[PDB]
């Protein structure tokens with residue numbers, strides 16, 4: 001049948017894997033009113049969206065004898081709703097300077113790759129030093145992404161810090177994917193210590209990214225050059241320190257999700 005009209009509150013339209021425990025509770029309140037259900041206790045599902053998605057339909061029925069089957073099917077319909085394809089490009093400094101920090105860069109990327117696993121996400125991994133290389137071409141195939149992560153872990157840092165070459169490969173793929181028609185995010189991990197005219201080259205390439213519609217983030221490693229990262233990223237609000245650990249990861253995750 002094609003007579004379903006499920007429109008969630010705007011702030012609940014993100015894929016349920018990103019729902020907080022409070023989001024789950026709000027979804028229940030919305031559903032009770034939308035579907036004229038009997039009262040749903042606010043603690044019926046004391047868990048976040050990742051956990052909600054592990055429950056079976058039987059679990060829903062046990063938790064809500066009056067409404068669990070309907071809520072489960074509602075969730076399935078929400079999961080089937082089309083969401084805009086979102087493309088994340090990681091542009092990673094493998095120069096000699098960040099050699100003793102490669103694992104820190106890799107681990108930040110792995111954490112973000114593990115977060116952005118909803119089916120509308122596609123990831124690409126690029127590394128740069130004296131030359132830039134696409135390690136993982138843009139894809140939503142989680143098997144290829146896992147292989148891309150294994151390849152990233154084996155990188156041996158060496159060479160100059162020619163970040164413009166890495167940004168160029170993100171821009172080339174964004175152009176091939178549709179340019180302004182795409183939803184594209186670049187995440188550059190670097191200390192931002194650029195030599196010669198590389199600052200000019202990098203800022204030019206980043207402005208090209210923005211002319212293609214992309215939003216540019218910079219994650220700083222080591223004693224990174226904050227001002228330089230601010231000129232590459234869209235703004236200081238899109239510059240995060242890799243040293244901020246979970247708080248920096250949460251900050252950048254929320255910022256990216258808020259581009260949807």
Ligand SMILES: [Mg+2]
Nearest residue numbers: 007008009010
């Ligand atoms: Mg509504």
Ligand SMILES: [Mg+2]
Nearest residue numbers: 009010011260
């Ligand atoms: Mg909104």
Ligand SMILES: [Mg+2]
Nearest residue numbers: 020021022023
């Ligand atoms: Mg929340």
Ligand SMILES: [Mg+2]
Nearest residue numbers: 061065066069
């Ligand atoms: Mg029953």
Ligand SMILES: [Mg+2]
Nearest residue numbers: 095097161191
């Ligand atoms: Mg460097």
Ligand SMILES: [Mg+2]
Nearest residue numbers: 192193194228
């Ligand atoms: Mg510099």
Ligand SMILES: [Mg+2]
Nearest residue numbers: 018250253254
């Ligand atoms: Mg999160």
Ligand code: NA
Nearest residue numbers: 003004005006
């Ligand atoms: Na319906």
Ligand code: NA
Nearest residue numbers: 135136147148
């Ligand atoms: Na790969």
Ligand code: NA
Nearest residue numbers: 087177182184
């Ligand atoms: Na793209």
Ligand code: NA
Nearest residue numbers: 183184213214
């Ligand atoms: Na965008």
Ligand code: NA
Nearest residue numbers: 230231232234
């Ligand atoms: Na600027």
